Amino acid sequence: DPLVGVFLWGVAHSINELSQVPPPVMLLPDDFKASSKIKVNNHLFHRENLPSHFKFKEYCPQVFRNLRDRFGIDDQDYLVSLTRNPPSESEGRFLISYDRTLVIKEVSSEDIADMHSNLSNYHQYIVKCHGNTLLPQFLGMYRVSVDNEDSYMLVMRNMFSHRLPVHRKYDLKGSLVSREASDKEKVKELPTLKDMDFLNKNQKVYIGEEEKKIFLEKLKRDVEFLVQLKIMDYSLLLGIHDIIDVYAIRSAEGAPQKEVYFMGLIDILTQYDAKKVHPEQYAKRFLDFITNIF
Amino acid sequence: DPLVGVFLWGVAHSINELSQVPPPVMLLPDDFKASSKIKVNNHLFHRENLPSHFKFKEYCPQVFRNLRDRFGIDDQDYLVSLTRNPPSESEGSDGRFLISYDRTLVIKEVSSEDIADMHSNLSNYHQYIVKCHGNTLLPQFLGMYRVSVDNEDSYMLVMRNMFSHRLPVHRKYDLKGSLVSREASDKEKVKELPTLKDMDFLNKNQKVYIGEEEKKIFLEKLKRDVEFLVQLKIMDYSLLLGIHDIIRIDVYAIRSAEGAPQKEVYFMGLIDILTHPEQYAKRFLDFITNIF
Ligand SMILES: CC(C)c1ccccc1-c1nc(NCc2ccccn2)c2c(ccn2C)n1
């Protein structure tokens, strides 16, 4: 595909540019309004793999580089992960690094515009909690272009594992209205189940009091932050593996199952799928709901 | 300097793109109309070394890559030579003129009008080079670029150095064999290594002593080189002649004969070039055949 080829070229190009720049000690207001653009135009050359006209734009290169650092990702390992072997495509557009450490989700221009408003607060928040959050870990944000058709790509750390594959998968909002996976959905090998499917299966999460106190104190301040930003309609992604992964929690010793849990916050924007009441209230309902999965 | 920074960035960038492409076995007519352009534009990012706005264009990437190959230059060694260390500047050309740190390459700024002319003859030049197996007194063109910094485009042209990477030139002549007197000005002769001309050559009574075998070869080369320049309707070219007195790769170099009055090394090749002419050639050949 052209869009992926240009994307992988652009990542390689931008990481190389950044190796020349030394990392600042401190970000500045302008670093969050910054970009790097490249317009390439090969006439009667290179016919292989890339198109002859394309653009590539990295949003806030200094901020994303600092976020990669703060989430313990090295710029060379980031490049290796996205380019050394091609990413796989999952069901817009939604790709996983060969090594299954990273996720690349196509988004809309209006999504990029939303991301820009809160990137500064997000950065402050990340510094303040030392990269330790259930929120998505944003690693980079790009606009690849092919003949005046722009496509916005957004890279996040995978909330799921590089090794242990997910057997069951839930999107939990704690809605008053029925949240049920449709029949169309349940024909998939690993379908995205919802609130009602969770309650009907009588699913519980068994992790132990120490681990749970930590997880819920994390979720509380993550959610308080989302309220602060006047954001809502987020879900807890919950993946379960029946028998470095920053979102993973082992089953307690007492547990009725040898299980590993993967939990983090998501959105229509940040969902692990292709692109398709007051916020203080949404939070309280949401927290009640997900406090009762243990 | 911005222009050199962008130039060296572009060379590195263009050689890297070419490492992805495998070299064709055969060029096509389109390879000689081809180009690679890049416009970079960083808003609020990294006002350091490169500017935030610039373009870079490589003319005929496939053709210059084939020419580098045909003149026995490896694309990696070419990149190493232009970028590993910064080039030095000389001030004897009508624009910028740089020498690779390793003194194997020369980078001469030219004009848009020059580039337009030189483009039309690159195909015939390529034919000619294949036909003579890279072995010519003409410049060995290795690459051809347009770096742009603000509104201001500057066309750069890379050639193998006709002079040496080791043995430095002590004396230096530009010979046309003009009807008018060609004389170095007084301003000039104050320089450490001045560019002397026809009349200065004749007055100093300079001769070139190389031996009849080596001279027959050199003159048969110059004849077909010059016949080619006529074919291209080109004139106002000079023979560059540099001399190393033995008091202290090089494809243009010839050692003094045994019988010679001096242990000297000569560097000769054609310059101010790839674009009445029948006349210019005859005068030019007569003149330079009489330097031996
Ligand atoms: C806090 C949020 C992660 C974020 C980080 C950086 C910069 C901006 C944002 C953002 N994220 C959106 N959604 C994604 C989302 C929301 C909640 C949980 C998980 N993922 C947003 C907005 C504004 C409207 N929407 C829909 N801002």
Ligand SMILES: CC(C)c1ccccc1-c1nc(NCc2ccccn2)c2c(ccn2C)n1
């Ligand atoms: C065109 C050049 C400006 C020039 C004009 C008149 C007379 C001489 C020269 C000259 N030619 C050098 N190189 C040999 C060379 C030149 C061109 C192509 C290939 N090779 C020079 C310098 C200074 C250092 N070098 C190495 N000047």
